Design a protein around this ligand. Structure first.
Ligand code: FMN
Ligand code: 18X
Ligand code: ORO
Length: 365
């Protein structure tokens, strides 16, 4: 399309040239929240529908956590053509996050580095914002457009598991799925929650709170992991997830690594790296986690998706669904319909009847 080219070659470079990346993001949330978007000509076909996590998903491409941290733009994100929306991460109490500047563009690498540090309106604000549209979301979910809520922990919290439990109780009743995000690179000690005895302790507590919700308000629970984990960490996670019956994994968050070859001037800023340089590290992480779980645990694949090929690589590696964020910052809203159109074309070219048939296909070769 002409929209894809206009956004990619004129509008997004112009906004990037005029605004620092945090300003640009704030303006994008605002625009999106108002539905001021090119609006998606792409009509989802049947072959893009996926059933997983106790829901129908009209298409398998979601917006990753971090774009709509506070649940302000959910409707606008469906209008952009996302098959599912994840908000957050949301912390129990409001908190401001790190001082600015705290997000940086690496245009020569099609990458971003961020260190927001869980800026969050907090659970009560987000609860009331979702309650104001609760029935509109119920109808969206029923029509195949589910809602995920990503839960974080406060910087000064003295008990991490209790922070997650409070999130389950408060936002669980309003979500189709919850995410225990234990993989932000930007909160001290958080990624240690990914180790064994303490992952099992944490997730048992979270699941017990989830199971204590009334049946119609009881969400799936997924664990979001980093791309930087050791072999041992990955094996431990797989074992716990199977043992507790966790509903799924989100693979991956941003990387603390700095792959060789980054060209951006800002490559050595502290934070998590996203976008193209993360792509194959995330794909490979999916591949390993799918094999370690025997293909029995749904995976949402994320990191560096900017095309149908990128989406399909993750699906064939084991993802049932994918998400993207950073690609938007570079290509804008038309990238969503692009990914979907390309993915549909590729599935037909490679002999798959739909997305579902492609899930984990590389492990059967
Ligand atoms: C600016 C920014 C903020 C993010 N904040 C969150 C967050 O609050 N919670 C979370 O689980 N992931 C967060 N992420 C990670 C993304 O959800 C995603 O896992 C990662 O960026 C890889 O996808 P991408 O390459 O398509 O951006 C953030 C990413 C970016 C770029
Ligand atoms: C002055 O700013 C604009 O004109 C924008 C913006 N931002 C417009 S005009 C029509 C439109 O669609 N957007 C817009 C909306 C959202 C994004 C966006 C969404 C997610 C992540 C990053 C950017 C980008 C856009 F250009
Ligand atoms: O708030 C952030 O800094 C943030 C959280 C997260 O989980 N991942 C990320 O890259 N940034």
């Amino acid at each position: 399309t002409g929209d894809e080219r206009f956004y990619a070659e004129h509008l997004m470079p112009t906004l990037q040239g005029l605004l620092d990346p945090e300003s640009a993001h704030r303006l994008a949330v605002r625009f999106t929240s108002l539905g001021l978007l090119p609006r998606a000509r792409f009509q989802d076909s049947d072959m893009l529908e996926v059933r997983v996590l106790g829901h129908k998903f009209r298409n398998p491409v979601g917006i990753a956590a971090g774009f709509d941290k506070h649940g302000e733009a959910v409707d606008g994100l469906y209008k952009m053509g996302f098959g599912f929306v994840e908000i957050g991460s949301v912390t129990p109490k409001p908190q401001e996050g790190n001082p600015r500047p705290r997000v940086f563009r690496l245009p020569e690498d099609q990458a971003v580095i961020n260190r927001y540090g869980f800026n969050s309106h907090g659970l009560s604000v987000v609860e009331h914002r979702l309650r104001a549209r609760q029935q509109k979301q119920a109808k969206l979910t029923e029509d195949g457009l589910p809602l995920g809520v990503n839960l974080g922990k406060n910087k000064t919290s003295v008990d991490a598991a209790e922070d997650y439990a409070e999130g389950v109780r408060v936002l669980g009743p309003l979500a189709d799925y919850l995410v225990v995000n234990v993989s932000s690179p930007n909160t001290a000690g958080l990624r240690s929650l990914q180790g064994k005895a303490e992952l099992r302790r944490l997730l048992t507590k979270v699941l017990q709170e989830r199971d204590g919700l009334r049946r119609v308000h009881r969400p799936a629970v997924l664990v979001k992991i980093a791309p930087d984990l050791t072999s041992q960490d990955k094996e431990d996670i797989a074992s716990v997830v199977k043992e507790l019956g966790i509903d799924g994994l989100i693979v991956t968050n941003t990387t603390v690594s700095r792959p060789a070859g980054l060209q951006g001037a800002l490559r050595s800023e502290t934070g998590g790296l996203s976008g193209k340089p993360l792509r194959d590290l995330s794909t490979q992480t999916i591949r390993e986690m799918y094999a370690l779980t025997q293909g029995r645990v749904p995976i949402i694949g994320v990191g560096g998706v900017s095309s149908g090929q990128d989406a399909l690589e993750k699906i064939r590696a084991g993802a049932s669904l994918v998400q993207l964020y950073t690609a938007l910052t570079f290509w804008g809203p038309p990238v969503v319909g692009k990914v979907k159109r390309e993915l549909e074309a590729l599935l037909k070219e490679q002999g798959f009847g739909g997305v579902t048939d492609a899930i984990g296909a590389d492990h059967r070769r």
